[PDB]
Amino acid sequence: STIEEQAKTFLDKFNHEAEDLFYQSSLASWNYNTNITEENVQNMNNAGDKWSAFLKEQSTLAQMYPLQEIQNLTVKLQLQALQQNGSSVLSEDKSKRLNTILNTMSTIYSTGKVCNPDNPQECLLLEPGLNEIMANSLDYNERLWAWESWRSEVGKQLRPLYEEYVVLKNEMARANHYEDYGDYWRGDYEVNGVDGYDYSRGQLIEDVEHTFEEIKPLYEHLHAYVRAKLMNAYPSYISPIGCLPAHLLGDMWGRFWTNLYSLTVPFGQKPNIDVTDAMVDQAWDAQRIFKEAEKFFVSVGLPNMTQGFWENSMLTDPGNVQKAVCHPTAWDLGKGDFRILMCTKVTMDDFLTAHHEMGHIQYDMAYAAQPFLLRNGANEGFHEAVGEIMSLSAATPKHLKSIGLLSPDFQEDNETEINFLLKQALTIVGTLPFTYMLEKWRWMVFKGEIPKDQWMKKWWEMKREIVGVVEPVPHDETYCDPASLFHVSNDYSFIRYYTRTLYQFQFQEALCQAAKHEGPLHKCDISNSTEAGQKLFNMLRLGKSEPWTLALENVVGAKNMNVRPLLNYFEPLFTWLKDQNKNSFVGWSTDWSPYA
Amino acid sequence: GNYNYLYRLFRKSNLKPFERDISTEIYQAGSTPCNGVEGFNCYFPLQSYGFQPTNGVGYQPYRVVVLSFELLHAPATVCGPKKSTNLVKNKCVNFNFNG
Numbered sequence: 119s120t121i122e123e124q125a126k127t128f129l130d131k132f133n134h135e136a137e138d139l140f141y142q143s144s145l146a147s148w149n150y151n152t153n154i155t156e157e158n159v160q161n162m163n164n165a166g167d168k169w170s171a172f173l174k175e176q177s178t179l180a181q182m183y184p185l186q187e188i189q190n191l192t193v194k195l196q197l198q199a200l201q202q203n204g205s206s207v208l209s210e211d212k213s214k215r216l217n218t219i220l221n222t223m224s225t226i227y228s229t230g231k232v233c234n235p236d237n238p239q240e241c242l243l244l245e246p247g248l249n250e251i252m253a254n255s256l257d258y259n260e261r262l263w264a265w266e267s268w269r270s271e272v273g274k275q276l277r278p279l280y281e282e283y284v285v286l287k288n289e290m291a292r293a294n295h296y297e298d299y300g301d302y303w304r305g306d307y308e309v310n311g312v313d314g315y316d317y318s319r320g321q322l323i324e325d326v327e328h329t330f331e332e333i334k335p336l337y338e339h340l341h342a343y344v345r346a347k348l349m350n351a352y353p354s355y356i357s358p359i360g361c362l363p364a365h366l367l368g369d370m371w372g373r374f375w376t377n378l379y380s381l382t383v384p385f386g387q388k389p390n391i392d393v394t395d396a397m398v399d400q401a402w403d404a405q406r407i408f409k410e411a412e413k414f415f416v417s418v419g420l421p422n423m424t425q426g427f428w429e430n431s432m433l434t435d436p437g438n439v440q441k442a443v444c445h446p447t448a449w450d451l452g453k454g455d456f457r458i459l460m461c462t463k464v465t466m467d468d469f470l471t472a473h474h475e476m477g478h479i480q481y482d483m484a485y486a487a488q489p490f491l492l493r494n495g496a497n498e499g500f501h502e503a504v505g506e507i508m509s510l511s512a513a514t515p516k517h518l519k520s521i522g523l524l525s526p527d528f529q530e531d532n533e534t535e536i537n538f539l540l541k542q543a544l545t546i547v548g549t550l551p552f553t554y555m556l557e558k559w560r561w562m563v564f565k566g567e568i569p570k571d572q573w574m575k576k577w578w579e580m581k582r583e584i585v586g587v588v589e590p591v592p593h594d595e596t597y598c599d600p601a602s603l604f605h606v607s608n609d610y611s612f613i614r615y616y617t618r619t620l621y622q623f624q625f626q627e628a629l630c631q632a633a634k635h636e637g638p639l640h641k642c643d644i645s646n647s648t649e650a651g652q653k654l655f656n657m658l659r660l661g662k663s664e665p666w667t668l669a670l671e672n673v674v675g676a677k678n679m680n681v682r683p684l685l686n687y688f689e690p691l692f693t694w695l696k697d698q699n700k701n702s703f704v705g706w707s708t709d710w711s712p713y714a
Numbered sequence: 715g716n717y718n719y720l721y722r723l724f725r726k727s728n729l730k731p732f733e734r735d736i737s738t739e740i741y742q743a744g745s746t747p748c749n750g751v752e753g754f755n756c757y758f759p760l761q762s763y764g765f766q767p768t769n770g771v772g773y774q775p776y777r778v779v780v781l782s783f784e785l786l787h788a789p790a791t792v793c794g795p796k797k798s799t800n801l802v803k804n805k806c807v808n809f810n811f812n813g
């Protein structure tokens with residue numbers, strides 16, 4: 119005759135029912151990723167609808183139980199997520215627009231078109247067409263057209279469609295008794311019910327800003343250094359007094375700066391650190407690349423992979439007619455079933471991608487014993503950060519020599535380390551402003567305190583101030599290029615990546631100190647250290663059962679979002695950049711010269 | 715999925731050790747009863763396990779059996795295979811016959 123027991127009586131039945139339906143949905147989705155046919159699409163829709171409707175009925179059955187007298191913290195988190203009414207407020211007519219509008223957006227977004235107007239020679243999808251025309255060509259005239267080939271042929275028609283999407287989604291906050299739709303994404307980091315450990319929803323914005331004033335000085339020198347070297351390819355086209363173009367930072371959106379390593383090599387006369395020719399010499403295969411990864415984890419102390427994975431998963435592309443997408447994704451089917459989806463290839467990124475992706479699977483099984491609702495990480499950022507810490511150690515020269523891929527006698531000189539450090543900075547430091555760049559715009563537009571006419575003028579102006587990018591060509595209001603990004607178009611919280619970098623460095627120092635490493639952080643290693651293994655496994659197994667704030671105290675002991683232990687990693691790279699930028703113009707103001 | 719094995723998910727009282735319960739009674743959460751029609755409180759305890767070849771080794775259905783050994787007033791139990799040897803003759807030899 120108490121509410122505490124009633125909640126438990128409801129969760130236990132849901133846990134058994136939820137996993138049964140989830141397992142059927144999970145296994146079914148695998149077939150669609152192996153052989154796609156006209157009869158396969160309808161089959162998956164039949165299973166998806168019932169699975170989607172299953173949670174709707176369960177949420178209603180938990181509404182009448184009040185949440186103001188359940189002292190047990192374990193069920194409070196589960197009940198809060200399961201009680202999300204969501205789209206139930208929308209009427210039947212209004213409910214049908216969500217599926218129709220999202221579906222047509224996906225197929226429209228999936229149509230890759232690079233065919234030259236008035237010249238239809240041929241044009242393939244995004245991956246074979248867009249990636250090659252920019253990662254290999256060095257022509258400005260065609261690159262500018264490629265910029266307009268996607269922002270003027272695909273995003274032009276999204277202006278009226280994107281308009282209706284934002285205005286209704288913002289209304290969901292009122293239906294859920296929330297402030298704004300942007301505040302909904304902040305509920306993951308919200309902590310309540312604990313005296314002194316509570317985290318306010320609005321504290322996330324201030325904390326992110328409070329951690330940004332230290333990032334800017336590092337970015338100021340990085341922007342100054344990169345522009346000096348980028349000037350070589352275009353001697354008389356860009357003045358070294360302003361900012362840099364948007365279409366020369368690796369990707370079209372500038373998310374990854376990996377491709378800029380070759381263009382800005384410090385001293386390319388000597389051969390780079392490449393072991394691709396070494397692998398073929400020893401005849402490396404699919405089974406050997408993954409087996410070496412397994413023995414890396416056992417050395418740390420973690421248990422080895424189960425036998426239901428090697429003989430149950432796929433490694434290479436099967437057949438020739440099977441064109442199913444093999445995007446890198448982490449699969450946790452449960453009941454000891456774990457699979458890896460990707461197209462294996464003999465390349466540096468793919469080898470790192472396999473190591474990066476398999477880390478997510480290991481974290482999934484850490485909290486397996488927890489119920490289905492709590493079977494997840496502490497927050498959105500923990501899952502991605504956990505799977506990247508081991509990547510840093512795997513790329514260290516010491517670890518490479520340990521296995522034997524690298525030569526036994528390989529000196530570790532200052533040049534041999536700056537290039538490696540620069541590579542990490544490009545894909546870590548370079549993307550940090552961009553991750554906060556996109557979220558800030560999304561947070562304010564979802565709030566609704568932005569008139570229609572100021573969208574484009576404000577987006578470009580503050581980009582030139584903080585990010586420091588000059589517009590290749592003026593764009594008017596009807597252009598909707600920021601919405602073309604994958605996460606924003608499909609309603610995915612992109613803030614999780616912002617905490618990934620901060621979380622990765624916070625744990626990197628925590629794991630390194632637990633490993634009793636004696637040396638610089640960049641040379642730190644985690645293998646052959648059971649002390650680090652047990653410390654990591656202690657927090658991974660927690661999952662969502664415990665507040666995420668307490669998880670931080672278990673590794674660094676700080677309840678707040680620490681910001682100091684992230685620049686120490688880049689302190690070496692910062693030192694050699696400071697003296698190299700003695701005469702370079704560091705610090706850019708408003709600049710109209712490139713396109714006055 | 716091998717949906718041929720079921721189990722009793724819920725029971726009002728803990729089962730007496732070494733008891734098989736075969737009943738159709740449904741679990742009672744609150745005070746409102748159910749007249750055989752499934753509702754929001756009937757909570758039909760019976761559920762069917764789902765076993766597939768893709769299940770993990772640690773979660774496969776293990777074929778487990780239990781053997782009990784207790785002494786009651788009934789004497790002359792039955793034991794395992796008594797081991798017999800080869801007889802010998804014309805030698806002073808200890809013999810251990812049946813009793």
Ligand SMILES: *[C@@H]1O[C@H](CO)[C@@H](O)[C@H](O)[C@H]1NC(C)=O
Pocket residue numbers: 149152153155157158
């Ligand atoms: C797709 O492949 C799965 C797995 O082999 C199979 O069960 C299914 O019948 C296939 N579907 C079609 C349409 O071939």
Ligand SMILES: *[C@@H]1O[C@H](CO)[C@@H](O)[C@H](O)[C@H]1NC(C)=O
Pocket residue numbers: 189190191192
């Ligand atoms: C909540 O109930 C579970 C049920 O076993 C128990 O393990 C846990 O310690 C309880 N927690 C609190 C805070 O009461």
Ligand SMILES: *[C@@H]1O[C@H](CO)[C@@H](O)[C@H](O)[C@H]1NC(C)=O
Pocket residue numbers: 203204206207293294295
């Ligand atoms: C969720 O939506 C339903 C349907 O209108 C409504 O009855 C309920 O009060 C809503 N709950 C919240 C928390 O918004």
Ligand SMILES: *[C@@H]1O[C@H](CO)[C@@H](O)[C@H](O)[C@H]1NC(C)=O
Pocket residue numbers: 422
């Ligand atoms: C995994 O580790 C266990 C425990 O040491 C061992 O018995 C087993 O053989 C290992 N797996 C493989 C494939 O060797």
Ligand SMILES: *[C@@H]1O[C@H](CO)[C@@H](O)[C@H](O)[C@H]1NC(C)=O
Pocket residue numbers: 417516517520521643645646
């Ligand atoms: C870890 O220990 C193994 C033990 O055989 C050794 O081969 C390997 O070189 C060691 N690696 C490091 C980085 O200490």
Ligand SMILES: *[C@@H]1O[C@H](CO)[C@@H](O)[C@H](O)[C@H]1NC(C)=O
Pocket residue numbers: 531532533
């Ligand atoms: C660091 O490496 C550079 C590479 O040319 C070299 O000139 C310099 O002397 C090195 N400094 C030290 C302290 O080894």
